[PDB]
Amino acid sequence: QARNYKLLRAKEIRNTCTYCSVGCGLLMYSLGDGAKNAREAIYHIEGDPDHPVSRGALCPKGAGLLDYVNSENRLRYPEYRAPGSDKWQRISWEEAFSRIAKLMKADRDANFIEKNEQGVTVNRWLSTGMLCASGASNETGMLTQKFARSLGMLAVDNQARVXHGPTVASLAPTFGRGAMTNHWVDIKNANVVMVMGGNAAEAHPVGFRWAMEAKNNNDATLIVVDPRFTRTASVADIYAPIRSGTDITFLSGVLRYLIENNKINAEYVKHYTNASLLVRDDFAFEDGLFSGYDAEKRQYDKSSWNYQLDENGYAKRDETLTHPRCVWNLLKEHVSRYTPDVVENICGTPKADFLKVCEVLASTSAPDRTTTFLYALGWTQHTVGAQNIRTMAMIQLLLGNMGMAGGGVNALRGHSNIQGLTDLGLLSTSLPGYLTLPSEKQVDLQSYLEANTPKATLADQVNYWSNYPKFFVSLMKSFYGDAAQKENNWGYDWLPKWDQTYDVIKYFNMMDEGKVTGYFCQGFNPVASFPDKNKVVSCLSKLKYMVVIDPLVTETSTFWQNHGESNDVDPASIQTEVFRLPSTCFAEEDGSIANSGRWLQWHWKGQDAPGEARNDGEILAGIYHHLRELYQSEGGKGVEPLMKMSWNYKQPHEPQSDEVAKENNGYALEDLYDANGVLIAKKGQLLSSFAHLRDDGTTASSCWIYTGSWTEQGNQMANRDNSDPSGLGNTLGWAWAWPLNRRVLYNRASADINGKPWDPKRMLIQWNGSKWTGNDIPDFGNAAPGTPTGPFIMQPEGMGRLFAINKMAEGPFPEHYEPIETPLGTNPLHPNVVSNPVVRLYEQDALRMGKKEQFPYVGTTYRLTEHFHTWTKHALLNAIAQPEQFVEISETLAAAKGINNGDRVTVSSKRGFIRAVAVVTRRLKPLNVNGQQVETVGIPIHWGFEGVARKGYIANTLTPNVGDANSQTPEYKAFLVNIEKA
Amino acid sequence: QARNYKLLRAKEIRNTCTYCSVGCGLLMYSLGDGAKNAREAIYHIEGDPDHPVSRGALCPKGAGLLDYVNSENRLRYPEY
Amino acid sequence: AMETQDIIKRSATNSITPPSQVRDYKAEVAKLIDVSTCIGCKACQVACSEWNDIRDEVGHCVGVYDNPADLSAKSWTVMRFSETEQNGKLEWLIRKDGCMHCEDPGCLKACPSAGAIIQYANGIVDFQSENCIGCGYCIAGCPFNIPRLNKEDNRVYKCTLCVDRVSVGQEPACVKTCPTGAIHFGTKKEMLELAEQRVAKLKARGYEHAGVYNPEGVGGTHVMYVLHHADQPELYHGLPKDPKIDTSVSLWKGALKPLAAAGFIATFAGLIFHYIGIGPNKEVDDDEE
Amino acid sequence: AMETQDIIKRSATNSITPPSQVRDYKAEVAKLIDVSTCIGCKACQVACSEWNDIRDEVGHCVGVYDNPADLSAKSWTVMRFSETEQNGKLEWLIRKDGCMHCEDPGCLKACPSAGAIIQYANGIVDFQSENCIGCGYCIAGCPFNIPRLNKEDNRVYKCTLCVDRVSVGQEPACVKTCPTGAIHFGTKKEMLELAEQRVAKLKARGYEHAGVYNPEGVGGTHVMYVLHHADQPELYHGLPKDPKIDTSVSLWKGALKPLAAAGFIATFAGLIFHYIGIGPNKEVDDDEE
Ligand SMILES: Nc1nc2c(c(=O)[nH]1)N[C@H]1C(S)=C(S)[C@@H](COP(=O)(O)OP(=O)(O)OC[C@H]3O[C@@H](n4cnc5c(=O)[nH]c(N)nc54)[C@H](O)[C@@H]3O)O[C@H]1N2
Ligand SMILES: Nc1nc2c(c(=O)[nH]1)N[C@H]1C(S)=C(S)[C@@H](COP(=O)(O)OP(=O)(O)OC[C@H]3O[C@@H](n4cnc5c(=O)[nH]c(N)nc54)[C@H](O)[C@@H]3O)O[C@H]1N2
Ligand code: SF4
Ligand code: SF4
Ligand code: SF4
Ligand code: SF4
Ligand code: SF4
Ligand code: SF4
Ligand code: SF4
Ligand code: SF4
Ligand code: SF4
Ligand code: SF4
Ligand SMILES: [Mo+6]
């Protein structure tokens, strides 16, 4: 008979995939029953059938986890690379901690800035910066936030900077919050699934099962719009091509089509958006430029981008929508230039295909039909990234799809925990809970609070950010405890104050000028992931010291080592001291991570880490306690802010995940009473809602949107009830979502002004005569139907913005601008303004930009389903599935260059080159754009110089060092290259 | 291949070593699933890995409990 | 061998001494691969190798997504990709390939080693490696070109239908892992029902020739497909149209044997009766009288 | 036999017909016995016999704590005690003895019965009793004097590394039971790391010759020791210093075979070609002309 079942007596542990943001459940199997004498070893991993999103399924990345956990390239011991050396030397943990602390202290004491030139206390340290791990837990993230900020760091970013920064920059201004609005299983309710700006069948495969459920079992139409015919196109009902960098034209064309045919949800638009508000008379737009442009600073004065004010100080309105200055009529005028011929001329999308998409989208303007948009980097990674997103969001507000089951904006996050690190604020000027560090002009608490607490711009609105001071003071009580009191303004002056944002491109520009001494890379591989790799390696080489913390060997850790054409450097010329510290991976600790749907999910430890690897919090605590002890005995600069940060863990060298998770939830520091004199919480108890946070020092929380995650009822992130009573796929008992377990944001819009569902088969919330109740937790207060209170409760006007007032850097309405490296060399809509007029482009990077005479083809970079960044090439299973680097090109271009399928080619740009196998296919086809034939060369990003797959070249050797005008997110998706036979 | 794992469908019961005062946890295995027609019979005893003091370990006395439970010298009937 | 006492067919075993098969009252199981829901993610390749404790070599890219390029002793299932404009627009047809667990397996019929290949009552066809002699006859007998020899041990291997999971009540590893639910598993009777429902929805979307691939030539298969173009299976990277056991193989393994047997028996009789009847042919039979 | 398809070595099997071993991508496991933490409690002897359903005879006391006095068919592991003043003060060195699960097992190499002794991909060396003929060659081939014959069935038995627990994901019985955690179990790679950490602490306490016993002569072992005096393994009740497969056994099982084969083939050729070339030696070859 068959071999026996190999897991019958193994230890079974629950955990969550460590790669993308779907958050699939895992069941991991270890050799050993947990007895103290058996050292557990994970030997198989499969899916958890009870998880509501994955239901047992795992894509090739999650299914291959065993080979990542047990990779031959797992890091085992602390290693050190001496200046000008060509080899690693093994050191002890205590030597690593003491050498790093000494280097840090010397640099901090030399360059710490206590006061700025205007006399304000700013306590900031700029010569050492940090990259944080979006693949590590939320408890690691909060420890990293405390470590960084208590030292005064401002150059602190996580992957959000090169990823979904633009989403937050456009979705927050439009709807009030920057996160994905619905959740994976909810996509099954859609009537139309649009995959544009994303490739969900390859980038989020197990979450995409729900789009296949809507197509196959809800009769939905799946549409893919992309320069390439991808694996998501394989299963699509409609495929339409589009030139990289032209989404705003296509989407603005869709707005013009909807308005012109009156394919809108008119009552939704009239009440839930700002359509009826009146805009200042001085607002204008002409020939590519909005009013207020200052051509020398390349920035706009946004004074005119605002509403007209009434007598009470509120925005003026015209409910009939006939006034020439209402948002609705200015929107109509703005998009009138984007006709179907203009879309075809700029995007290259055939009019017949563009028409099919417009007609299907238009069918969801009915109240009981919805479109859901699934997108990610195809829209964010541009110099107009944020504006791409604004256009789509506007479409969803015209169709009335926000707040509906099967509707919304599913901005699919990337890393497993990029949503938690964004929530915890590991971004230059951020604090946890979407709070902001003080700017250096805000000289006291009162100024700071006033700048961050918005006044309502229409009467009768929830305007929930009016509670900013309760969140802020609670954060300060979490950080400083008894040291933060009313008398010292809750420790206000201990936080670093910023003079500007220290985004990654800027900070590498400072590193190139010799202003950066040290850098930490915690679970981030910038040699692979940052634009213009040859410049990145040059900038890192000027560092005096680098600390890498990771479970695997990365290209970044070996940037000083010669790897031939892949990394042609001279070790003897690089003086950086490099510390490589071996950390745990997802399977070797307990903790939480937040998926794309905002679900905070707990996971448990299945084995110890290999060798002398330690957990991320233990590595930060080693360095931190050595450093703070040096300050205790030698003194130095910025002593107080550093020494006042709390580190209240039972074992200070080993902070536990539950202690940190509980601090994020928050506690009552005194007994708390409601207005009726009823006890709401006792001193010492975990809080059950952010509604109980106060601004008087009686409450603490290091992450206000996380209040409710771990209460007196227990760890809600460990809840495993997959019940779905409505049949809509909403499982309120599985894990815990922020905010307050609301799974579908903006769900008051799922009903009309009288409280009646737009679609009676999809009721989310309903009015019972005194409260809202239903199949989801209401994202709303208790305003009764018929009152003026808008459903977007974080917006000061309570509405979805069609016109984004003064929030966007380049305009309150989106406008087409070409990529910095464009194949046309001009912009057919307005040749006087080719590219975004507010883009920041450093002079050194401007010299490294190419033109179409030398680099005639559009270059774009993207992912393949089988690999995750340059991480899974260290896993044998994934290396077998896609072993060797390739690039994709059309049959037409291959014939022109005499390239046969499978031949080697050389792909180059103004910054460098890569060599690879050529995949020649009809899936890529030239498009007719502005009288030219434009070809695209496709460059997957998974290969490099470390790993078990065949050695290749970093794709970022080709990409430009320029980014979105709002978040500085690099333009990785549209640039210019040349190709030659090799 | 190897003989099958002999406890796969046995009844597992938690108990404590009967000899010294360490108090080591036990996991005792009986032939029979608890049904009324099967008279349970303990046929193997090993440690409980989750016990904080013993963590699965058993000295030669606790590891040999099966031979005391099933000793040939167990008393069966009242004798005079 | 035969511990499960449900062996309905056994290679190189005379038809009058059938294998032990008293416990044959069991439902037939089946995998259903609906290629219209497949996203070509290769999860099934990864889950299969992880579960089965096998790893192929790190290969090369030669111009296509397909990889490994073929089934092997270390790759029991592989995704096969096809780009085509034969139906009027660009289509990317992706199909999971691997053993079909035929009702009337040609591998089993061609195998000359007793017990090397067996068929269980539930439909699983599996290799019993202790008996394999490495001849490769099964590679030619299979209508689907499935069996693969392992150079390190001279034995053939292929998809076992996760017999080690199914035998104790769990579905196969690739079935559970499939991201989009393109792969389904259950009893054959309920997979044929799911297949017919899916065909009906594909026809409703415009695929007038959608159909179930469960070839009657091999007696039906326990690994079945739902195909958008069932009239043109060769579009799916060469899936055979109307597969059957080759005629040459049928005759070689069939009638040739008894015919040869009769010749041999007859010949031996003839020669023996001939020697006895006529007697030796010595130099002189004549001066014997 | 071969159901697990991960058999990397098999007794008395020609090198050109290797056993089934396609599922060989598995981590090697290992037991680590740190004799510096051993308290000589004999729990491991008791747990081993309880788990394995074996009982030795009630023996005798002959002046030492050791009992039973040796490994036997009914005692697969035994504690061996040594009192010594060789290092300058009284020391009681106690070591658990039993199969070392060698990477290159001498038992397997000396065995003349096909399949009686096998080696799994994870390192376990186990006896397949259906094939054992009771010759005892493995007793002499083993460098550690491990195999023991059972008079009641004429077959050899020894520590199986609890292959029946390890095969389904549980550590062996003696490993789990060890009171002081002298016995550890896991992958070989992590047991070698624990071994080196323990050596480092013993050196820090004054044992300059502490070391890991994982003999290179047999290719390393899957049962390893941490010894306070690794320069003097014989102090631990005769543990061999630099064990290897005996030279006589290597030559007997190695070159002698093919050499004998050539002789036999050559001899048969010679005699056959000789008879044919010269013809018989009859009484008169001469009056034939
Ligand atoms: N398989 C896999 N999964 C991933 C990742 C991975 O590494 N591997 N990474 C994770 C991460 S961190 C992220 S943020 C996500 C992102 O996931 P996605 O953004 O979906 O994935 P990409 O492949 O980067 O890009 C999507 C598509 O953009 C198309 N495209 C190129 N330029 C343009 C253009 O300007 N406009 C339009 N409309 N499309 C364009 C590309 O051809 C590609 O098909 O993936 C996550 N999931
Ligand atoms: N050209 C081009 N460039 C891109 C993009 C693109 O489409 N085009 N996409 C961009 C985006 S959206 C992103 S997110 C990036 C990502 O690029 P990166 O995030 O730098 O790349 P990864 O290879 O994902 O690196 C993650 C590291 O985290 C380590 N990690 C795993 N778990 C832990 C842990 O528990 N703790 C620690 N400390 N380490 C851990 C892993 O070993 C791995 O080394 O690439 C960006 N760059
Ligand atoms: S990578 Fe994403 S889709 Fe794939 S298993 Fe992991 S979480 Fe799920
Ligand atoms: S197992 Fe041993 S140490 Fe534990 S309680 Fe029993 S007699 Fe005491
Ligand atoms: S796992 Fe499923 S969707 Fe993915 S390639 Fe295999 S059959 Fe297709
Ligand atoms: S290779 Fe094996 S299984 Fe195939 S026919 Fe030969 S003996 Fe049979
Ligand atoms: S597909 Fe081939 S290998 Fe599989 S059962 Fe059928 S004949 Fe045998
Ligand atoms: S049924 Fe099992 S053996 Fe077959 S392809 Fe699937 S995982 Fe592999
Ligand atoms: S069980 Fe452990 S401590 Fe006790 S005698 Fe055996 S190896 Fe030593
Ligand atoms: S006693 Fe058994 S196992 Fe030992 S060598 Fe003989 S047949 Fe082999
Ligand atoms: S110690 Fe002896 S019985 Fe055990 S594997 Fe090694 S040679 Fe064989
Ligand atoms: S590993 Fe198992 S068989 Fe060996 S001594 Fe320990 S209990 Fe006995
Ligand atoms: Mo990302």
From Swiss-Prot, chain A:
Residues 10-73 form the 4Fe-4S Mo/W bis-MGD-type domain. One of its GO terms (molecular function) is molybdenum ion binding. Its cofactor is Mo-bis(molybdopterin guanine dinucleotide); [4Fe-4S] cluster. It is an enzyme of class 1 (oxidoreductase). The keyword Ubl conjugation does not apply. Coiled coil: none annotated. One of its GO terms (cellular component) is formate dehydrogenase complex. Belongs to the prokaryotic molybdopterin-containing oxidoreductase family. Trimer of heterotrimers, consisting of subunits alpha, beta and gamma. Formate dehydrogenase allows E.coli to use formate as major electron donor during anaerobic respiration, when nitrate is used as electron acceptor. The alpha subunit FdnG contains the formate oxidation site. Electrons are transferred from formate to menaquinone in the gamma subunit (FdnI), through the 4Fe-4S clusters in the beta subunit (FdnH). Formate dehydrogenase-N is part of a system that generates proton motive force, together with the dissimilatory nitrate reductase (Nar). This is Formate dehydrogenase, nitrate-inducible, major subunit. It comes from Escherichia coli (strain K12). The lineage of its organism: Bacteria, Pseudomonadati, Pseudomonadota, Gammaproteobacteria, Enterobacterales. The gene is fdnG.
From Swiss-Prot, chain B:
The chain holds residues 34 to 113 of 1015 of the full protein. Trimer of heterotrimers, consisting of subunits alpha, beta and gamma. Residues 10-73 form the 4Fe-4S Mo/W bis-MGD-type domain. Exported by the Tat system. The position of the signal peptide cleavage has not been experimentally proven. It is found in: Periplasm. This is Formate dehydrogenase, nitrate-inducible, major subunit. It comes from Escherichia coli (strain K12). Formate dehydrogenase allows E.coli to use formate as major electron donor during anaerobic respiration, when nitrate is used as electron acceptor. The alpha subunit FdnG contains the formate oxidation site. Electrons are transferred from formate to menaquinone in the gamma subunit (FdnI), through the 4Fe-4S clusters in the beta subunit (FdnH). Formate dehydrogenase-N is part of a system that generates proton motive force, together with the dissimilatory nitrate reductase (Nar). [4Fe-4S] cluster binds at residues 17, 20, 24, 59. Induction: By nitrate under anaerobic conditions. Belongs to the prokaryotic molybdopterin-containing oxidoreductase family.
Curated annotation (Swiss-Prot), chains C, D:
It comes from the Bacteria. The keyword Endoplasmic reticulum does not apply. Residues 1-255 are periplasmic. [4Fe-4S] cluster 1 binds at residues 38, 41, 44, 178. Its cofactor is [4Fe-4S] cluster. It is a single-pass membrane protein. Residues 279-289 are cytoplasmic. [4Fe-4S] cluster 2 binds at residues 48, 159, 162, 174. Keywords: 4Fe-4S, Cell inner membrane, Cell membrane, Electron transport, Iron, Iron-sulfur, Membrane, Metal-binding, Repeat, Transmembrane, Transmembrane helix, Transport. The chain crosses the membrane at residues 256-278. [4Fe-4S] cluster 4 binds at residues 111, 132, 135, 138. GO terms for biological process: anaerobic electron transport chain; anaerobic respiration; formate oxidation; heme oxidation. Signal peptide: none annotated. InterPro entries: 4Fe4S_Fe-S-bd (IPR017896), 4Fe4S_Fe_S_CS (IPR017900), FDH_Electron_Transfer_Unit (IPR051555), Formate_DH_bsu_Proteobacteria (IPR006470), Formate_DH_C_sf (IPR038384), Formate_DH_Fe-S_su (IPR014603), Formate_DH_TM (IPR015246). It is found in: Cell inner membrane. Disulfide bonds: none annotated. GO terms for cellular component: formate dehydrogenase complex; membrane; plasma membrane. Binds 4 [4Fe-4S] clusters per subunit. CDD domains: FDH-N. [4Fe-4S] cluster 3 binds at residues 99, 102, 107, 142. Induction: By nitrate under anaerobic conditions. The 4Fe-4S clusters from PubMed:11884747 are renumbered in standard order. Formate dehydrogenase allows E.coli to use formate as major electron donor during anaerobic respiration, when nitrate is used as electron acceptor. The beta subunit FdnH is an electron transfer unit containing 4 iron-sulfur clusters; it serves as a conduit for electrons that are transferred from the formate oxidation site in the alpha subunit (FdnG) to the menaquinone associated with the gamma subunit (FdnI) of formate dehydrogenase-N. Formate dehydrogenase-N is part of a system that generates proton motive force, together with the dissimilatory nitrate reductase (Nar). This is Formate dehydrogenase, nitrate-inducible, iron-sulfur subunit. The gene is fdnH.
